[PDB]
């Protein structure tokens, strides 16, 4: 019973706390420690949350974060699920649907990406100005409920334009140069071959992952504003010769996390 | 039970009516109209036919109307079931395998549809030339009865080249101007982003939707004839702002209706 | 249960012969008759094995052989099952799996696909260097257990780039011409429309098939070496008349047979 | 001296008839009887025109013809020269210059192309929505008279729109199916090989010839009113065997002249 | 006698002053007010130097200053020539070939380019990252002089690296957003047609324009450091309505002009 | 005197010997040396010709070698010219033309090019299946003479299909990989952009080099049947670092010498 399974969730997170948060926070995969920073009021692991989906994938700790970030009220997921996981659409996108419920309007979705634009570097990051599911999956598919959102949601402007031109300035106010990109959603959890790299970057994507799409098109469904950020741990150009692994993309995520923590805090700082 | 489940549905139909049709007719959304105009013989609503998928969609009565029109014994389905509603492939094609088996061995298939071909216009009808499937779902997956058809169908020529002729030549009588391309199938329901519309354009879609070609498929493994009409309701074009909502796709198509029965009926009289 | 219902397959299979195979040769549509040249020690139908997806498609004999082919120790598939059946992408490759830890190392994937390359010939043999995945499922969706392989498996050089090597040094000796290019797997089991055709091959794909990726997947999962080989048993470029029917990819298959098993035996003599 | 040239081209004509034309009318490769059936005033080679270029090319008589057609005031080209003659851009579009200060302000150009777009028919009729010069040659290159026109002509809706939407209203009157596409000049004169017509398909041609674009870019400097007709004299698209030879273009030319005369006829009728 | 030549015009400079500029300076269409703003210590009108071509386009004056410019000596063109005026390729670069050997071994190339990725926006600057040459000409082509530099000058890193970090480094120093790209040379001088605007996009241009690239090549034939900048002044889509007018062009690049200013003096504080 | 020119060349090239030659051989940038295997008969330097352009480019001798190799009577051309050092499309072509009115009815073009496809590697050798003019030059542009051709020569087959199967034969003999695909002719001298090289391999281009293409027109033209051969000498793809030098290019030519030449005298052994 999709909302009485939302309502379920949300009142198990009020019996642990009456904070209202405003931004909704979702870490990728080694992206987890922003969550430390945090001035904690309740912790909740996804395993206690009626109807929460529990993390499986390496670099994902399963644990929700209530609490004040550069002076905002936010909801931290540290930690998220995946399709690859086994995880429908629908199950994927129920933990952003909860945080959306509970108060949250605004929400950042950061992830580990490959990097299809040649141009780019390992150790970069790149704001969503876009998507594309390559994933054959879709979390809205069955019965729609009228008091989530609309049948059929417009994703124009899923990334909001306003949330676009605040991660740029805060890009130069902090004297980072910030990629930009269409993000493809690849279900995985293979890594792409040579020809699926070639085939997704002249389909027009910039960075390649197994995340966001799904809590993007659910997002928007809801009415929520939508903030997409990738590392870029690894380039995925299938005409050098080396595809990252696990171990490198985690440690590149890890390396990556000061100026990342150091980006994210300014955007939060100034929304 | 699939073939029993076929003949428990054509059983209930014939339990109604002896009325035996030689031409289908899949009416889309905001297109359910036409069926008034049927002299109607029976009238079952979809919940009542053993095994039928009952719409849900907005636009969508889901009624089998038996009867003459433009003097023509037809089969009109006022509205029809989407993949996006959470009906396999399969379940999405019941309808008109029934509709084979009732004796409608030529159909017309009618859809909203977005324009990706910029040059097209709202408000316009696209004669179908062929389809592409980017939804990752066939309604054949699974065994196949050779009292149906056989294993591995043959999709060149999916669309009648006798009816595409036909659709040309009324088009002139009328002095109608008949936009002509490739359907592509979008999952939904969520529309597609700027870059998805992109990437469709650019592997050759001049129109995008969310239904028809499972249809399209089930028909051909029959061997029944085929024409596929889609009112162009919106113009979805990514370097341009705004993609129509779901009002503005339905209003378009009612709006268009007279151009469009009239248009219909044009063939009908030619079968 | 999986692993436990690998090991129960290895346990019947040792059951009927304590053969431990060193290469695993998969016969696609068609090519079963190189399971005859086998010299046998054990024959074993797949609805016998615990587990095993039993061959359903024209011209898969679902069995299994153990022996001697041109001195290496061989499972050998007469007959394989695809994703178009019914099948699961993991039911798909549970039969390779199952084939890995009875001990065949190296793989050899046969298959009857489409030439979408127009430089390619009916009668044709396609070397794979590369696959593209257009059927929207991957054997290794849902958990992953470390006993078989890693959680994010890199699938650059999928195709061992010194089977590769072997193989153009094998149709060179033999005079053999041999095309070489990009296997895109298409779900089926209808046939790609002219369209999907187009498409497929301006996405990088040089043939078109319904098997075979998955099996590249779960065999890279667990670190095995893959050559994949396609008998180009029709052209499908769509500017031009006639798509070929089941018939007619069954009829090339089995009139390019001799050369084709001429050619495999090479292979497998300098194994 | 270029306007001096023109004036001295205009004078030498005038010196022959005060007839004034109202429409410009190019006949190309085989297209050529149409003049036939002109009521004539005057018929001047274009040898004895100070500053004309002379027609080398097979099936161009070479011959300025004024008078009356289908009740209408017309300055007929029966030949043009094209850029593989050796004659820059500039000395290409000199006669259709001088053709629009005798005053036709709106003009033909019809032409012998190849069909790119796979959906064509040798002996079809193609609208020009719009080119692309693949030629590496402009006509306007040196230096600028505003007598003429603009520095920077705006090269959007060079084909004019009332004229494209009049060319369909005709070819509905006379129950005609008119292709539309897209012109690309290829210099030539070799015929383009199988490469070059996949990259100039691929680039949104639907049809190569070697002329009409210069003429094109000029009267749109002029301010004149522009519709391109092509027959679609052989199917050139590069995966089906034979590019058709010279003999074969002209012939097809004379084949469809009768449909041709009548559809251009119609057009004139109607301005 | 090139080389004698390029000495001459060197010649006729040192005998009107004995000033060595550090940094060559091309201002584009309507970037020329940036000139006045030089702390001049000579003028010298392009038609009295020694085979210096003439600018005949609208928005360029025709003028090389010397001087002094946020604390560098500059060698700044108030204006250049370009290809559709007449000019070769070798002649339209004989400026900048004269300024390298008056000791200005860094150039800035700024020219009024449109805009075709559709990510742009009218009154933003482009950094170039890259060209594309469609203009069908080299400068090179003709005998090499080993004294300019070799036969076959590699373009990788054309726009020098450290120069595109500094321009990056000042546009987020003064809280400009800096759009990057590739820069297409179309020859003109006709605007683009839509089918023309849509090859370059899909070709990877982000912006069009009519000058710079032979400049840049002939700047890398020398070893030449060189930075490309664009106003884009336009937004050059085809699947929107009207291009930009010649008028709207000159506009726009004067809007622009302040902010344009601050940027490229920012730069020159920096070298 | 296009043609007097020809007899005049033909006529002093008799002044020094009878010897007809049957096989044309164009050696290019490093590959001479196979000349100095040629059994001489006669040695005629370029310079001394009536009507011969001569060798400016690097690694060409600028010689004409008549005599007997490997049993074949040969006109070996001991290197070439090129449209980059000034030459005309129609200059380029004098020599093969000379060639073809001596006897020479077979032609093998040889060539340093660029790997586009990054499967080639450097040092391997590609066969020439058609090819891409990106140069904007045609050596037929201008008045033809019936003698050497008709006005419209077809380009489909202009690489010969037997001697291509005679090709795959000679390397499968000699345990050689052969690589096969487009070439594209790049007018130069300047080496392509990072986007000119990534726009050529879209377009369907396999080697990049400035030469051949005005060769295989002209002998297309005459009737010759060609076999174009390139040593690919660098890999030239934009998404690695470092494009190869000049030097470089003719060092790796150099080293490849020996496998190429052992090829050739294979091919001339067979013809």
Known sequence: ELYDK???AVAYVRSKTDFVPEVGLVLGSGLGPLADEVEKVAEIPYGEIPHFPVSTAPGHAGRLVLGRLEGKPVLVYKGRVHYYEGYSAEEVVFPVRVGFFLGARTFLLTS???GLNPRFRAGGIMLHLDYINFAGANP???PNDERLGPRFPVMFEA????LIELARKVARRQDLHLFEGVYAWFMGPSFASRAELRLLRELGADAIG???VP???ALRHLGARVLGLSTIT???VPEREHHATEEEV???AAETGPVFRRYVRGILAEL
């Not at 990334?159 to 306003?162: A, L, Q």
């Open 210 to 212: 197994m995340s966001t």
């Open 215 to 217: 809590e993007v098109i």
């Open 250 to 252: 985690l440690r590149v």
């Open 140 to 142: 809205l598919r069955g």
């Open 234 to 236: 690894d380039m995925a």
């Open 112 to 114: 580990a990406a490959g």
């Open 6 to 8: 939302i309502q379920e």
């Open 159 to 162: 990334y909001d334009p306003e």
